[PDB]
Amino acid sequence: PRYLKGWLEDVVQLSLRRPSVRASRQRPIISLNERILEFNKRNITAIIAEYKRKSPSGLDVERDPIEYAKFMERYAVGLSILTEEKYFNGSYETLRKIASSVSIPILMADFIVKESQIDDAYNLGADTVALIVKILTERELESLLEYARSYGMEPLIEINDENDLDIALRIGARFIGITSRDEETLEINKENQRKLISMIPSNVVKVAESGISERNEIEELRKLGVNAFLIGSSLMRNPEKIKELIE
């Protein structure tokens, strides 16, 4: 991985030593990016609802994961499950139990730095994974993208700046998340997020991530070409909000 500082350096070293799991997957992969495009053709707002108990930006809640997932199943285009343990209080069991309980596509969100974490996502039932450009070298990113595709996944390649975007397009990403949060500093910049969105080709499936709480922002981003919206904190604190956000 890259040489980082602060909490990201810590989470990367933790991830390198993450013990892998063993299990026989039950259901074939179902595509999150393809379901997003189907929602777009149906003119249904496509929200990826995220389950996370804690975050470095101060979220700290307890909520039953299965009850949350079963509620979201009616409304969300997919789910994102945090599996990072130290900063997000996620776990592999959380992913396994949620995947075993819903039929919509599931994204495992963690700090993937080694192939066995993709093995873990597959064996636990996830349909895809996030790969974060700013924690990986270009060579690692290309290799992990190919590895995930060899299972039948289309990973969400996450970008925050123009250097990240250059890499993501160069390596052939087809499913890009544009996060407004710089994970190193926790700073939110929506202007920069909109700039990057405008630089992505129309045939790439685009997901806006971080800081979304209001239907007005979803509408404005949809007008700019965003295909789907990854929303965590606001839904973890008031799950029923997704109903208003999709209206």
Q: Helices 190-198 & 162-170, crossing angle to 10 degrees? A: 30
* CB nearer Zn ion, residue 65 or residue 232: 232
CB of 131 to Zn ion, least distance (A): 10
* CB nearer Zn ion, residue 100 or residue 163: 163
Q: Is 158 a binder of Zn ion (CB under 5 A)?
A: yes
* CB nearer Zn ion, residue 25 or residue 184: 184
User: Which parts of 75-202 are beta strand (E)?
Assistant: 78-82, 106-109, 128-132, 156-159, 175-179
Site for Zn ion in 38-97 (CB under 5 A): none
Q: Which stretches of 54-161 are DSSP H helices?
A: 65-73, 92-99, 115-124, 138-150
Handedness of CA 32, 177, 86, 111 (dihedral sign): positive
| Helix or strand run (H / E) with residue 47 | strand 47-51
CB of 22 to Zn ion, least distance (A): 27
CB of 26 to Zn ion, least distance (A): 26
Q: Which residues contact 133 (CB under 8 A, 6 or more apart)?
A: 141, 157, 158, 159, 160, 164, 167, 168
Of all residues in this chain, which one has the CB nearest to Zn ion in the complex? 158
- What is the total count of residues that contact Zn ion (CB under 5 A)? 2
- Give the DSSP letter of residue 80: E
- Residue whose pair of structure tokens reads 């013990």 in the numeric block: 19
Q: What x-and-dash track marks residues 190-209 binding Zn ion by CB under 5 A?
A: -------------------x
CB of 50 to Zn ion, least distance (A): 8
Q: Is 164 a binder of Zn ion (CB under 5 A)?
A: no
Q: Which stretch binds Zn ion (CB under 5 A): 7-15, 68-76, 152-160, 218-226?
A: 152-160
CB of 201 to Zn ion, least distance (A): 20
Checking phi first, is residue 84 left (phi over 0); if not, alpha (psi -120 to 50) or beta?
beta
Interface with Zn ion by CB under 5 A: which residues?
158, 209
